[PDB]
Design a protein around this ligand. Sequence first.
Ligand SMILES: CCCCCCCCCCCCCCCCCC(=O)OC[C@H](COP(=O)(O)OCCN)OC(=O)CCCCCCCCCCCCCCCCC
Ligand SMILES: CCCCCCCCCCCCCCCCCC(=O)OC[C@H](COP(=O)(O)OCCN)OC(=O)CCCCCCCCCCCCCCCCC
Ligand SMILES: CCCCCCCCCCCCCCCCCC(=O)O[C@@H](COC(=O)CCCCCCCCCCCCCCC)COP(=O)(O)OC[C@H](O)CO
Ligand SMILES: Nc1nc2c(ncn2[C@@H]2O[C@H](COP(=O)(O)OP(=O)(O)OP(=O)(O)O)[C@@H](O)[C@H]2O)c(=O)[nH]1
Lengths: 139, 175, 120, 347, 52, 49, 83, 98, 320, 63
Amino acid sequence: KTLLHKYSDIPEGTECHRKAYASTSIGGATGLIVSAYSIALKPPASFLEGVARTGRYTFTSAAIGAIFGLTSCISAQVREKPDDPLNYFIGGCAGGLTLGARTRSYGIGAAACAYMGLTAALVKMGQLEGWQVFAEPKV
Amino acid sequence: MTMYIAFILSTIFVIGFVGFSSKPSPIYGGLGLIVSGGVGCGIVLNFGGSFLGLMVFLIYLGGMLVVFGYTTAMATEMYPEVWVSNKTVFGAFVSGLMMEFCMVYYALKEEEVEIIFKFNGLGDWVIYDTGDSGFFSEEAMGIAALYSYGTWLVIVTGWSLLIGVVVIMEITRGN
Amino acid sequence: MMSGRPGRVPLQFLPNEARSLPPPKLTDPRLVYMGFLGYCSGLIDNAIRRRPVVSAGLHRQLLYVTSFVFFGYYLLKRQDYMYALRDHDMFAYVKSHPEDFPEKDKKTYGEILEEFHPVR
Amino acid sequence: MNPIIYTTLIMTVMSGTMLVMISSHWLLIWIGFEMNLLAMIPVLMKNFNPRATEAATKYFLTQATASMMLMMAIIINLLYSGQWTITKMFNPVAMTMMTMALAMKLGLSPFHFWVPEVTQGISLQAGLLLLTWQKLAPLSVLCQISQSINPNLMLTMAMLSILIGGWGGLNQTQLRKIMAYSSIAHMGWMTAVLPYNTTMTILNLLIYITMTLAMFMLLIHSSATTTLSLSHTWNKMPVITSLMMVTLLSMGGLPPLSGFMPKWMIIQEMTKNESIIMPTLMAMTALLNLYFYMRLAYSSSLTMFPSTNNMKMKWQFEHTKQMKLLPTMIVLSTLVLPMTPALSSLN
Amino acid sequence: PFFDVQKRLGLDLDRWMTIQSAEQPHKIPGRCHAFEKEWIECAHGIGGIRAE
Amino acid sequence: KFYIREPPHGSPDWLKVGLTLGTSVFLWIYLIKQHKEDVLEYKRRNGLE
Amino acid sequence: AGRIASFLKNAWAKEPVLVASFAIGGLAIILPSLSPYTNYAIRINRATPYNYPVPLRDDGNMPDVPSHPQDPQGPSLEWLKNL
Amino acid sequence: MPLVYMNIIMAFAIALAGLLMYRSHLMSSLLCLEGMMLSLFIMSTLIILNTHFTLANMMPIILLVFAACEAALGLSLLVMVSNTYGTDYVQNLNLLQC
Amino acid sequence: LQYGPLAFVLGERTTRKLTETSKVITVDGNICSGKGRLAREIAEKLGLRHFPEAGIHYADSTTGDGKPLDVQLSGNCSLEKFYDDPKSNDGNSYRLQSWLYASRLLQYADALEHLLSTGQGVVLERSIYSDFVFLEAMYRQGFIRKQCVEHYNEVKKVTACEYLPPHVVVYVDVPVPEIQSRIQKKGNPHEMKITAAYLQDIENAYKKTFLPEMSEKCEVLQYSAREAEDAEKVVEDIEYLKCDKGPWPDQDDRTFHRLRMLVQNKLEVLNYTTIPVYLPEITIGAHQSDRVFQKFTELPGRKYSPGYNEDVGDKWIWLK
Amino acid sequence: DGPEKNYEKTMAILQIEAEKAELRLKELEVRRLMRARGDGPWYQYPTIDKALIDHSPKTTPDN
Ligand SMILES: CCCCCCCCCCCCCCCCCC(=O)OC[C@H](COP(=O)(O)OCCN)OC(=O)CCCCCCCCCCCCCCCCC
Ligand SMILES: CCCCCCCCCCCCCCCCCC(=O)OC[C@H](COP(=O)(O)OCCN)OC(=O)CCCCCCCCCCCCCCCCC
Ligand SMILES: CCCCCCCCCCCCCCCCCC(=O)O[C@@H](COC(=O)CCCCCCCCCCCCCCC)COP(=O)(O)OC[C@H](O)CO
Ligand SMILES: Nc1nc2c(ncn2[C@@H]2O[C@H](COP(=O)(O)OP(=O)(O)OP(=O)(O)O)[C@@H](O)[C@H]2O)c(=O)[nH]1
């Protein structure tokens, strides 16, 4: 997971440009996966509509990654908090607000803020700690 | 040349697969596999395996595939697409061409192809073993054990074929 | 886990070592539960088939209770055997690997400084 | 079919899986999978209706392709170790290859779109065979090679089954479709615990098998395939709907019913393996299953539904089939929670 | 085997060809018979996780 | 008699029912016998006998 | 008896190919069992040295194994010679 | 490792892509599924013959005799969807939408 | 033993019992056309099994003690009320017709079971393939509306599909004015004030639909009353016909075993009669249906399975 | 009854609970080490038995 390794290797807050590029790369790659499924299970009319679906989905996902990485890093060193989960909390809502503007709905934007803001803190929450999502079979 | 003959055949084997993997007209797709079936035996033949290779001709190429195209003959629409027809079919063919060209080029220059399985790019012949086989063919004496060691294999494969004969009627009965 | 421990004669519902265990007493609370399940099976069997529930072919109820208890009783023997087997091979590994399970040292609560956090 | 000829097809597939659970050779395992497929196809098309013809085609293409993918997983392992015995795999891509190949035979991850359509087309009696017996054969191999399994590889397959099984189950109407999605959701539970300790994988299998027969043969007695059709059965056979409700609660997972058997131990098992976020998601998303269990429970027995005049005629005649093992299957799937320490027998 | 009826009944169905160092027709070697003899004879009664 | 046709279960299937009690007593007597030899074997092997 | 004999006679009357097939298959399954040369077939089958007769380390106490190939000790296929 | 095996290994992959992608006709898909076991046959024979695994010569003959059983089933199903729908196009096979 | 699949293996084959005199002859016709009379004469001439017209209370005669139950408990529809006023808001028009179709379906099943088991030919008036003429007449005359038609023919599709058409069908075609000529004599108050067009609409729906949709699947031989008294001729035509052009004289023993699977399961043949499609005129409300079922349950014998009701004197219940 | 019944009964209950709790805590440690170094009775994954090898002289002398 070299692509995921980029975000982890760069120190939090420091090197905002590197964090932003890595974070939007993660979002863009994720956008590729979902868009590829969307064309597969639900085909569009022609290829031009297919890239149209890819264009929307990738732009949304890349935007979420870009804004999350930018806000998380720019909030860390400004507040001088390289460990507080709040550095990712406003990042999740930054993506949440970004998604809301992408689909043009206030209600979905607020919900995305609440949900992504919680998960982003939760994802950070495990980074300081030893939380494992795919823990090896020790016992 | 002649040293790379197994490589040469293996190359035709791959492009033969692109012939029917591209899903052309079922008769034409069968033909693309027929040549692919033909060359594949030669790959086996060059390694020994006369009997195992000969089956690919007999019970598969002259066997399974005969009734295959036979079904395509009486089935299918009245307008069979000629290999060019749909631009996707030719797009698939040229797509198959670029995969075998890039690897083979990579194989013969750097010899360090790592795609999925790490494979070093030497000639076909640097893999053969050494030693005399006495007076018995290794392939012939192996599958001749069907009735001396192939005990549980014969009992099960025979039973399923009988079930194969009964399942085909039951599906084709039409209730 | 089990699975392939030394000595695993396959399809052996009761290995010979199980004969060295105290057999489950017929008055076992687990055993009578099997009997209770058998009765509930009998009640459902008459209920599903439009029969007069309790007083409807008590012979079927007897078969259900007997089968559940008998099939139950052999189950506890295997249940107790494997449970005893888990602790048996356990109790020997600790001996063979003493440094893997170091023993703690006696420290009474008079010396242990458990922090006292005030509560308000 | 001819009763004697349907019998052998029913139990050639009985033997096909029986070979898999006893074969120590990789080729022989594929042999049992072949007879598994070769005998499954006719049973799916006992009635010969275009739904069955479609269902057989979808089922055959999926299972055949997975079988072929299984073979090269066998060949690659042979290519790198020259060992035909079933043990831990000696190469990564071979391990990755069969996990997906075995998954498609079972069907949990995106390789699950066949499961709903195939059971919908085929008859209810063949539905239980597909949803109950056809899952021991893939699971037997997975429990065998669980040591070499890739922990990341399996677990993401496990959730994607339960999330898909949990989500899509709400919108389903046909009872077979609901049963299939719950089967997908249940399939995820033991597959997740498979890398850690296969004893709970078998334990979840046995309990899930017991619950599914109780579900399917009761539906067979109801002679209903739609929620509305099942709803009517409250008047003619009120007892069955009451039993329909208890097994729905059981197979929902609420304590002290037997649906709390697998989850609780599975939740406990992974918690010993330090994986604690993982159980919480599955337990919480399991409520998605409970919702359309509640939806079926509401329409079946808890609230009676409008009936038809012609069904007064139904009351005048008694049932014919004896629905063998139904009484013992129901009781063995509702009140076995106090017998939880019996799981030590499996290991 | 998941259900090792092979061992219980004491009758062979599949282990004859499982390894190339087993009995062969007219006693012909399987190329690497010498090496896999050493490995298998290293691994017996050791356990899967240990032997690797 | 009510029903025009004699009903399938109206006549007690004496062969079937007597068999079920036959298994019931056989199943019990083996259970009693099984417990005694198990108890005796445990009494003997574990050193108390 | 009478019907069975008549059954065979009418079987030969209209279906002579199958009764020929069943008779030949019927025989071909049971003479190999009680054959007196089947053991001979096995004996000459093992008496065909595909593989070399690898020598044995002479440690004594074994008189059956010949010291010389032409020595009288050891097995002989004199039976194979006349049959 | 010899390039003849990688030639076979892609041969599975290109066959795998053709089987999964589909264009119009189930005949082609059945053809693609046969290239699957075909490339498996040469790959099996190639390894087994190279290593002189005498008993393993079992598997090549056993492999395709059971793979051909797929053809016995796969070909039969096609004609039934051909008898009822007409052309065996995969797009026709959509009745089980629910 | 019953026809459980074990019995098929060790014995009974349906084809052995079937002979030439194993037809499913149905004698259809207009109202009071003697179709019941003619069917009786034909059946007793050939020694077949005559089945009287499947009424609203026929199902009661097929179970219990052959005692017609209360109309609310056995159909919730009175034919006499329909003849009195079919446009009644209670929906007696379609409710009577739909229940009658189910009555014919049960009547047809019993005839099929007897024919497959005994091998003796069966005779029944009307059919499940002929009840449509009444509703089609009941439609054009304004007795019902479109929704009743949709439910009925859909029930025909989901029930009559696995019931092949009979070997030969007898149609006695009395002219409508002649049927009028006899009904004043009949003197049954409800069935006097029929609409002449409705009985006219009985006849034409019989004319260009019944025979044409039955001719291609079976021989249709037609008479009137003058040949009904002349039944010695209507029977020799049955002898003359080969029973050709029919799907019965080609089925093998396998299908007959499948057919006996369906018929012996009485609820199975009735399973698709009670479609969950909610027609307002036939949908029984939850409270009324629950009370009616409680009324049905408290009836003697119906409380438990047959042979399991000690109320009617079934001893040895404790050891059945 | 007397309070000595409750006192003695409970402390025996506490004693039983302590051994039960201690054994479970030791169990996670025993099972952890077994699955790591694998030199114990259980968790022994299957291996090919040393009896299937054909030790008779082969056709090729060096093999
Ligand atoms: C520090 C490391 C990370 C740094 C970067 C931040 C994280 C990565 C970027 C954010 C990823 C999660 C947010 C969602 C991204 C995908 C959005 C997307 O697919 O949008 C399109 C669409 C929503 O719109 P739609 O419902 O189609 O309505 C319009 C129809 N015309 O989508 C849909 O309809 C489907 C719903 C969305 C797609 C499925 C879920 C995708 C996300 C799963 C989790 C990804 C986690 C990534 C990070 C961890 C792993 C590396
Ligand atoms: C774990 C939590 C609880 C889980 C389960 C909850 C179940 C109920 C939940 C709600 C269900 C939906 C709403 C109600 C549905 C009712 C279903 C039904 O069929 O109701 C009507 C029906 C009428 O009764 P009927 O069939 O005529 O039989 C009467 C007895 N012969 O009624 C019946 O058929 C019911 C018949 C019940 C028969 C009970 C027999 C009791 C026997 C007791 C024996 C005691 C022996 C004691 C021995 C002591 C010494 C050892
Ligand atoms: C309706 C949604 C929820 C409503 C509110 C419910 C309560 C909120 C919190 C929910 C807690 C769920 C998880 C708690 C289970 C036990 C966890 C525990 O005991 O604490 C562990 C806390 O560890 C965790 O990571 C536990 C999970 C934390 C939260 C993440 C998952 C829960 C939230 C998402 C799922 C539920 C929300 C709904 C989603 C649809 C300690 O382990 P450790 O991390 O110290 O382990 C040792 C070492 O450090 C290695 O880790
Ligand atoms: N509404 C309605 N009434 C039906 C239907 N089928 C039969 N009937 C009634 O069945 C009753 C008996 O039929 P009739 O023909 O009058 O009987 P019949 O007077 O004995 O005369 P034959 O039938 O010629 O013997 C009549 O009142 C019909 O209206 C149906 O589908 N709908």
